[PDB]
């Protein structure tokens, strides 16, 4: 369930929710700025049109080239039900709220006006302690809601009743992701689990859009403070200040650049040795997931990337891609000079170790043998292929294997075929 982008969530929306979600304060601005470079023009054009137009016009207004992108963007906006063909008339609520959004249409005593660096530092701090709890740290910040949240997010599982929760296959993969992507998956799971737990996604999600620029919102907002995404000096203040992370929100690494705008620290040697100029134990814990740590200094740690530690990581669920990415995104300024930044021998070795771990591909299936004829065999094979139930075939050897579920269908068909007698 690697929901790497907003588009997957956008498809997970029905008209009965889209219409309410299409509020005037933030959704229109957030949605419009997220639409493709093409559709944004047409939506803005028809913002003053009360009468639909034929698809041929939109089609002829684009060259033969880029027509696929226009079709794809048309598929999205039609999938978003932003307009109706009625033959592309915008939805009245969407048009009206977009119109009001252009101009708009609340105040009180001054706040503590805490410095933006301070806000982003404790936000990063808050996310770090969340990850410190996520990793196998002997001590970390905890909270019943935080724990169950990470658990319902599929990141952690409790092996025994009363024992501390441990990390799942997805959790290990998640831990290595970059902060924005890592935060994104968390936000997405919170949103999904919110509607699941009865929190109105409409209001909280619209609120997330507003932060990027009721009791349900207050409860939700309290969690956002606990996530460090918003600052509130005291629980009594009716006003809050969104942190950089909350402002970024669903902008992704494309907005204001990736998290790579940070000091690099991992050095990778051709002898699989790692030197990470770091004091933050979270980085150490992550490095320990796939490398054998040797020595720790006040500002640096020495480790080695072995078959044991890597194949252990792969066995736990990690991939060489995530490892190579984790290193590359953290590579120290000194090794940035060489190209590629990581030594090819290292990258190739890591990939080759994971590829060894899956030398054998295991697949459940049911095998039929001793087909009395090539005709009925190929006939049954064609049916298995028509059903997409086929797993593997060797017509020369007159054999095929099918998925156990699909097998019941060929079992039924085989019996039907045999019962024709």
């Amino acid at each position: 369930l690697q929901c790497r982008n907003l588009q997957e969530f956008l498809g997970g929306l029905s008209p009965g929710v889209l219409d309410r979600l299409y509020g005037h304060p933030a959704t229109c601005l957030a949605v419009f700025r997220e639409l493709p470079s093409l559709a944004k023009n047409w939506v803005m054009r028809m913002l003053f049109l009360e009468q639909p137009l034929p698809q041929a016009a939109v089609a002829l207004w684009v060259k033969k080239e880029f027509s696929k992108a226009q079709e794809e963007s048309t598929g999205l906006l039609s999938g978003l039900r932003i307009w109706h063909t009625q033959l592309l008339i915008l939805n009245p609520i969407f048009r009206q709220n977009l119109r009001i959004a252009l101009l708009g249409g609340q105040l009180g005593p001054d706040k503590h006006a805490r410095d933006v660096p301070s806000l982003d530092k404790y936000a990063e701090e808050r996310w770090e302690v969340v990850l410190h709890f996520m990793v196998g740290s002997p001590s970390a910040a905890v909270s019943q809601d935080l724990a169950q949240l990470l658990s319902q997010a599929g990141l952690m599982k409790s092996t025994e009743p009363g024992e501390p929760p441990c990390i799942t296959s997805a959790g290990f993969q998640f831990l290595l992701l970059d902060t924005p992507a890592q935060l994104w998956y968390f936000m997405l799971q919170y949103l999904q689990t919110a509607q699941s737990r009865g929190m109105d996604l409409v209001e909280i999600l619209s609120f997330l859009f507003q932060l990027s620029f009721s009791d349900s919102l207050l409860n939700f907002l309290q969690h956002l403070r606990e996530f460090g995404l918003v600052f509130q000096r005291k629980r009594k203040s009716r006003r809050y200040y969104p942190t950089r992370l909350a402002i970024n929100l669903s902008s992704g690494v494309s907005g204001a650049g990736g998290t790579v705008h940070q000091p690099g620290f991992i050095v990778v040697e051709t002898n699989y040795r790692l030197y990470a100029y770091t004091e933050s134990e979270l980085q150490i814990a992550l490095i320990a997931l796939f490398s054998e740590m040797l020595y720790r200094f006040p500002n640096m740690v020495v480790a080695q990337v072995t078959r044991e530690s890597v194949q252990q990581a792969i066995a736990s669920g990690i991939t060489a891609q995530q490892i190579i990415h984790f290193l590359r995104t953290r590579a120290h300024p000194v090794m940035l000079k060489q190209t590629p930044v990581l030594p090819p021998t290292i990258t190739d070795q890591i990939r080759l170790w994971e590829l060894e771990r899956d030398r054998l591909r295991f697949t459940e299936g049911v095998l039929y043998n001793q087909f009395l004829s090539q005709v009925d065999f190929e006939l049954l094979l064609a049916h298995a292929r028509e059903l997409g139930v086929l797993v593997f075939e060797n017509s020369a050897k007159r054999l095929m294997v099918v998925t156990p579920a699909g097998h019941s269908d060929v079992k039924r068909f085989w019996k039907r075929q045999k019962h024709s007698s």
């Binding site: 060489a320 891609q321 090819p344 990258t347 190739d348 990939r351 080759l352 590829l355």
Partner: peptide
């Protein structure tokens, strides 16, 4: 002339 072969130019591992 005498350029490196392909197997020494790029990663031969499927990745």
């Amino acid at each position: 002339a005498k350029e490196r072969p392909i197997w020494l130019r790029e990663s031969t591992v499927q990745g």
